[model samples]
Target chain A: ARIRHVQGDITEFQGDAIVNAANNYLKLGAGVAGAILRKGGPSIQEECDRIGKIRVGEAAVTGAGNLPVRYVIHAAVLGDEPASLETVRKATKSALEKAVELGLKTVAFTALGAWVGGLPAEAVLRVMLEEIKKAPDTLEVTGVHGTEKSAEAARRALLEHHHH
Target chain B: ARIRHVQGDITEFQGDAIVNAANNYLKLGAGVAGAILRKGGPSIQEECDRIGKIRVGEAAVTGAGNLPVRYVIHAAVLGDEPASLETVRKATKSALEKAVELGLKTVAFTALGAWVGGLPAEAVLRVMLEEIKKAPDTLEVTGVHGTEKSAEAARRALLEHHHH
Candidate 1:
């Protein structure tokens, strides 16, 4: 799979799917979930309410509502508890697998569990890159960052992955 | 009381307090609550969790975590149900009273109940202004709007109130 990185709003991504760093409750209340719900409209939350709770490290797919993408992959990277490297790794892998399961060609992701979840950028990127490398050859991925600092971290992680 | 209007990010306001358009649960999940929690830090949510649930139309106060203001007044303008004119009116009044009880000199507010709550800008502003006019003279209120359209709506509402 080809991997690319860009810096901007995740909701504006025009790919087949965009990943939400969702909590287990899938409430779409804050951070990535909040922004997606605000831009994508209420239908996304309506679907989430119907789906109910998901386990950490699992992922769910829902309609994109008014967003440009076709689907929103709700990755349960963090929840009521602080995020861990294991959860981030498993959640990223699950999100990608869900994308492939839907036969999506391209998927976009933000820096999962980095901001409000209080995980370091480099650590989060390391695990995310690990999962991205394992994604099936049929899927193309893009790492979307909202800030220069986050984008730089993704770039450094990508470079390190190439060297390894 | 003196009332003023400005268009910008509410979290950036330098004042005694900034009003959060909160839900009854006070989880700080999305919309105005989400933006405030992201910028203010996790301490705000910790305080809300301690305070527990408040009734609709009631207001609560918490220390501003990392925001510019000294306090954050969580106004329960909407909860499990859709926002209504009465709840918005009472919530605004309760927030102002909370600020006055703290002996604060100034408070800033966004257009509560608009946007995610699905209330119109004009209606939200009208009730807010009504409560602002009733506030004790020791407090000064500023209406902060995040968009040009929202700011324009505030300006028109201010004009209509002036005529009345």
Candidate 2:
């Protein structure tokens, strides 16, 4: 069965689209994008440089390259201060809607790491509703092999120092 | 200071807004809103009805009524079809961003029970690179409260029924 929900981080470009949360300037300095550049290899860094700055309330698109998915959509969640819940919700909905429109079914979200609410009781209500409903399945496992390889490397490197 | 993230459902409304993962039409079925309506002694169903049907990638606003919140913003994430990962993410994000824009900080998210991604290697990578850097406070408590409130609640409810 497709993965419907698990609570954890989701930023790797393994899915059809990897989400990038940008600050107000649209630049990727710290945060998940930074890690993406670090682990996705330097090629992603060069690609990000081409992307340049994005607005706080908007999102940008790029190639998936080495990742499993076809594209990367850099979603601008909050600014230095953050946009209104309305804007963030709209932006997220629109971006994902657009991605789905592009025919991408499975998209990974980093925003889940936080309790994002357009309003106060909003998020709570959403979750409560989902408990009764069988959620949609849109995610695919992309890192099972990568995980095994990493474990092998780690077990060897830490224990034998010969896996790398 | 406001609700950064919590493990269980929301008990307080504060001044923040609530995003409803509503149908294409603004009808309230179940979930957080259902309880809030039942407990708070009020709901937004009529106001929502007045707002009429919302299209995908769109939203509408209604009164929080007796609920502690000031307003309720309904975003149309799924238009009667099974929800996709991107759709759920976008819907939740849109509702959240909207609330933040409206100037409410203590936001809440619900219905993520099924839409959330799991703790996989790729997901962990995304967490480090993307989710962790930006929204570190979002990580929820693990164990009984975090993972299986539903199971616990159901077990007790079932026990009471058997006794009856």
Candidate 3:
């Protein structure tokens, strides 16, 4: 089964497949993509550049290099360069479907309130998680830990999961 | 010292103020507030209802009932009840400033993207965190774990004490 847990940021998630919240413009906008770029190398963007922009609810898959994961799934959260609730629901479903189609057992997502504007990310996130919860065999879900924190806290959680 | 940790939802960040990424109408539309009302009791809205409406980049403080935090900081992230880069930035900055003015050492904000419309929340989040790094004393930012993976990755790097 895919080990699912709450992870607040991208840098620390130990999943095999991680999702990228891409802008409708197809450019790797800030947040998760930035973190991946910083760790995995600019080549990620280079590949994304080659893939070009996909429309809303569409996804493009790429290899996860350098990072702990195996593949990166870019889910178009917002199109028209603005995010909306419909965009979020559709993009999430697309991202999930894309991940499953790729035969990726483990995947994670960000609830940064993408394609849909003016909605709390947490609310959208709960909906996303709720949907994830309903999915059987295909995906396992739980655990959400953020990245920024007192340096002390960071060392505690990750290490517990790491060496254990 | 306060735990500079990115805890759970806006619910975990215990302080007098809870910031909302509201739409331009400054209306408490959906997402976080929606969740808050769902979980935090109807009195939550009763308190929010007293604040009337707010201007973009303006924040109105309210009480938190049945919630861990003490107050709520509502900011206009999107003017038309939709979202954009401009709205996110304005609301975040305004929320932080209002928190400081309130003499509140710590305030909590929910990472919202499509709460109103199409704002590239993750990329916009990178910008938001960048602003957070510059003004660390005025705010303490947090995110829901599953919603943002890349943001955590970047935070790990940014928060890293080069130790050089």
Candidate 4:
């Protein structure tokens, strides 16, 4: 499996599935989720709304709408307690599970809970990579997307995560 | 208080003090530690050895040998289960305590466990922020240094951490 992380807008990162730092309501309110919704189109939001309220730390898949990808994994990394590490962990794991179910070879992820709930970035990064490391070998490529800074952080973390 | 996360080499990040992802033996062997020791000059490592072995997840300070910063804080985020979250937490907290002790207004940090223990970035980010949030008001600013992507992650995390 290959982990590719770089600095760029999550919306622009091409992959089989892109994970959103979503809310329980699936509103795609702001931050990475908002960006995904805006670029991926309203149909994506509609599908999510139709999916109804997802549990915090759970994930649901929706057609990518207008996105180049095939699917968007809405991982609710924020809720009443956005700072909770378990929330990010479960959300990330669930997102990856959806990818496995869909047989996605490549997936891209935003910095979940880092922006929406002002949760700690270090924590968000830890949960994300930890879950990713446990992903099945069926998945081949994992792309971590974010602004330049987040991309760099993810890259650095991945290097160390795999280095030792 | 503000947390400024930027993507760049930690060796280049300027502040009153900068942290090192150090070892229990206080040997600045590789990664960020090596970079700091090599750039800050060998005297820095010598001082560290003189200080003796620091417990895992503990931090110690020394004069910045030739670096621009005033102090170099060596935080043992490695050894044993190097990936432990508590290690990063205590190391980060101890480094901050040293800052408070000296009444420094600002400090710069690297992704602690991410580099050495192959720890998840989320955990490191969380521990770093959790500790920084508890920082005294006297500590006016905190800087998180990494690649451009890491900085974005840190920035977003701090935004959420503070916003909520």
Best-fitting candidate, scored by TM-score: 4
Per-residue lDDT tens digits of candidate 2, residues B54-151? 66545666777777777777766555544433345455555555654566554544443232221122211211122212322432211112335543
lDDT of 3: 0.61
Runs in model 4 deviating more than 4 A are A144-153, B1-82, B85-164
Relative to the real complex, the DockQ score for model 3 comes to: 0.03
lDDT of 4 by residue, A5-51 (tens): 76666677677888888888888778877777788889998998799
Model 2 lDDT at residue A36 = 59
DockQ of each candidate's interface versus the true one? 0.01, 0.05, 0.03, 0.14
Query: How many Å off is the CA of B95 in candidate 4?
Result: 25
lDDT of 4 by residue, B12-109 (tens): 76778888888887888888788888889989988887999768877899998888899988888776555566667778888888888888987888
Give the TM-score (vs. native) of candidate 3: 0.43
- fnat, candidate 2? 0.00
Better of 2 and 3 by lDDT: 3
Candidate 3: which docking quality band? incorrect
Off by over 4 Å in 3: A1-164, B1-7, B79-81, B114-116, B134-139, B147-151, B157-164
lDDT of 1: 0.83
lDDT: worst 10-residue window of model 3 chain B:
B1-10
Question: Residue A156 of candidate 1: its Cα lDDT?
Answer: 75
Evaluated with DockQ, which candidate comes out highest? 4
Pitting candidate 1 against candidate 2, the one with the higher lDDT is: 1
Tens-digit per-residue lDDT, A1-164, candidate 2? 13233343454444577666555454556767666555555666566668776666566676755666677676666665444333454455545555655666666654311333222222322322232123234433221112454334433423331221
